């Protein structure tokens, strides 16, 4: 009976591949070939936050486009004030092995996680004045790799045990779990409408999820190595994934297939983080070659290099209003570019 | 600039706190445990007292050791091994009562992040290895062995195979045989770590 199931799966895969290949009327390059290029994007460093003493793996902007939080390996999560480079908070961590962080859209909470398999929720507006942990979410087997805040209560986390989870901070329980990935899930992004989200795993496949129903809808493949980052298009109907093959790819949700590949024969190091712009025109990716490249999304042409880091950049993210770009690296310095 | 001055003094105070905490925490020495399943890591971490990562810290002759057992992470090693790029030494454990550990040693000794970090090799269950030798020749595990059948030569052969995997001339491998009933583990670790500290500081000064 196993052979029959395998044959049915192969037939379904052939059918879906034929359907996907039938809808490729033209490539994205042939459509956006007649538009003017972006040109040269020369960005100069504006600020520099010299507070950390070890490697940095996470940096998430605030909803007010002024406060930023960075999690480092010194066991400290220091909330920054980008306008004046002022340290406003310094939260010690129980587990110094942290590789992700998030800042709540309301601003009242900060989440962090790592090799301890626990997503810790911190409260920043306590009446006592200090910052204390409010909830310790536990239940993952593999290391937590990413976490985002849907709202002031719920939180979605992508762990390394081939599972993505939906939690309730009020009760501290796994409301909904998602399964289907074969390898470690190393990235997560939530849609602007907070109803859909996607995960980039180490099995070279990107999947789309439903927060409410809890079942997968589409599966995207085409990468040759593990996926390290993911980010929706500002319109919410597309996303881009950066892999360890030194290439970026763009996927269309309605077309259900890849659109463009951002590859250059010069670059060989892997990609650590990706992020769009406010208008979705520029795609900034953080390579392991100590530099950040700017990719024109609609033409796959390089527009400038944000060199200046002494080590590999581990995180990148633009502000909500798009007035600045933050790059965190392993050299303990987070720089605000504009 | 009314209450911005208070913001500046708060920022300077917490920056001073961060610097003081970093200076205080730079004193501790970091060690990384590794090995096969049920290879004897638990025995040595429990002999010194005190699902995710397991941290054990003990002080022995004015040195603050911090062992990071990471055997509980049942995931891909490549995606989190770089977090320990700054450890002083890698404590490697091999069970002599069992081939599968050679691949792990080769992978961990030639990794790009550990080209300059030494490996301290502990061989456990020496009595069990001798009992197996008496019961069966050591050629079952190593079909290419051509020699006598006793404890000493088999131990030397296993040591040679485990040491031949090194390729960088800037790293050293310290080895020791444990009988699972001795308290010399702390002394061996201390004597290896002091030499490693001396070598690291000399190489930093450039005199090495």
């Amino acid at each position: 009976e196993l052979d029959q199931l395998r044959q049915e799966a192969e037939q379904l895969k052939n059918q879906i591949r034929d359907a996907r290949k039938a809808c490729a009327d033209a490539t994205l390059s042939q459509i956006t070939n007649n538009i003017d290029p972006v040109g040269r994007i020369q960005m100069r460093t504006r600020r520099t936050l010299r507070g950390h003493l070890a490697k940095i793996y996470a940096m998430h902007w605030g909803t007010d486009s002024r406060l930023l939080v960075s999690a480092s390996q010194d066991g400290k999560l220091i909330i920054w004030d980008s306008y004046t480079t002022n340290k406003v908070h310094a939260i010690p961590l129980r587990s110094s092995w942290v590789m992700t962080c998030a800042y709540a859209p309301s601003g009242n909470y900060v989440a962090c996680g790592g090799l301890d398999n626990i997503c810790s929720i911190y409260n920043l507006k306590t009446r006592e004045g200090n910052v204390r942990v409010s909830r310790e979410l536990a239940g993952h087997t593999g290391y937590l790799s990413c976490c985002r805040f849907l709202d002031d209560n719920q939180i979605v986390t992508s762990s390394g045990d081939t599972t993505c989870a939906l939690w309730d901070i009020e009760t501290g329980q796994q409301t909904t779990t998602f399964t289907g990935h074969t390898g470690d899930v190393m990235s997560l992004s939530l849609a602007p409408d907070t109803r859909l989200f996607v995960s980039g795993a180490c099995d070279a496949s990107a999947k789309l999820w439903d927060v409410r129903e809890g079942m997968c809808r589409q599966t995207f493949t085409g990468h040759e190595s593990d996926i390290n980052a993911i980010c929706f298009f500002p319109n919410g109907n597309a996303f881009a994934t950066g892999s360890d093959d030194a290439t970026c790819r763009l996927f269309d949700l309605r077309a259900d297939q890849e659109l463009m590949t951002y590859s250059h024969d010069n670059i060989i190091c892997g990609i650590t983080s990706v992020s769009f712009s406010k208008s979705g025109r520029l795609l900034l990716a953080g390579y392991d070659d100590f530099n950040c490249n700017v990719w024109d999304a609609l033409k796959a042409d390089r527009a400038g290099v944000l060199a200046g880091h002494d080590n590999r950049v581990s995180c990148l993210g633009v502000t909500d209003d798009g007035m600045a770009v933050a790059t965190g690296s392993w050299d303990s310095f987070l720089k605000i570019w504009n | 600039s009314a209450e911005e001055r208070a913001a500046l003094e708060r920022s300077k105070a917490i920056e001073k706190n961060l610097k003081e905490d970093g200076i205080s925490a730079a004193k501790d020495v970091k060690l990384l445990l590794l090995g096969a399943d049920n290879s004897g890591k638990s025995t040595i971490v429990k002999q010194m007292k005190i699902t995710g990562i397991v941290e054990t810290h003990f002080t022995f002759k004015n040195l603050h050791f911090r062992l990071f057992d990471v055997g509980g992470q049942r995931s891909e090693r490549k995606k989190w091994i770089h977090c320990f790029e700054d450890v002083t030494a890698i404590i490697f454990c091999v069970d002599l009562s069992d081939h599968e550990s050679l691949m792990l040693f080769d992978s961990i000794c030639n990794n790009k992040f550990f080209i300059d970090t030494s490996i301290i090799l502990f061989l456990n269950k020496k009595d069990l290895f001798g009992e197996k030798i008496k019961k069966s020749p050591l050629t079952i595990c190593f079909p290419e062995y051509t020699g006598p059948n006793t404890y000493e030569d088999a131990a030397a052969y296993i040591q040679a195979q485990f040491e031949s995997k090194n390729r960088s001339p800037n790293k050293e491998i310290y080895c020791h045989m444990t009988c699972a009933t001795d308290t010399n583990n702390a002394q061996v670790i201390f004597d290896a770590v002091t030499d490693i500290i001396i070598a690291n500081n000399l190489r930093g000064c450039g005199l090495y």
Partner: single-chain antibody
Amino acid sequence: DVQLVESGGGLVQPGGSRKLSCSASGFAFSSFGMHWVRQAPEKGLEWVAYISSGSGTIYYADTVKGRFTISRKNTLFLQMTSLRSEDTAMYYCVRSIYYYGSSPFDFWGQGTTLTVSGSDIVMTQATSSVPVTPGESVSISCRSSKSLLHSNGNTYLYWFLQRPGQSPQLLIYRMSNLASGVPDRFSGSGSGTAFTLTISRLEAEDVGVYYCMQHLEYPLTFGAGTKLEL
């Protein structure tokens, strides 16, 4: 929860000395700055002294400089020397923490009563009293001698409410934000020098005396107050 109980007042002959101690509990006192605000038995509030976190910066009013001393075990002290007949008042202990988005002067102490036998930004409240019926909207106006809007864009007009026979409570900070724990009916606004605070659906809990305070430069000059009697 939070609590700032204090004692040390009483009857002092002129030329004597005393020591008022503020005991703080229920919060991280080491990270909170502490102020000192007194009030005459019939007049309004007036700033006295201020000490920062870690005893870094200390300030005094022009009329008290040299005579007093502020020092900080979770306890705040106010060394007091050469008491004169003008120093009789009720002294309050006030906490305040300053960072981005912080809420200074959020909590006030119970208070102690003590009985003794040029560059200031002048703030005036023209309306001494306002008779208002319950359920009707009211307004309180304040003025200034200098513009309180700094270059960064934050105005520094603070609004307080003093219920009859009770310690003051923070209502609106930075002339636009609402303090925690106060109902949303309160609202405030202003422009440069003139400030106003509006109340909708007034109830019995809104009866009291409202105070207008600035924070742009020391000394922190208070207002004469507006009495919103029933």
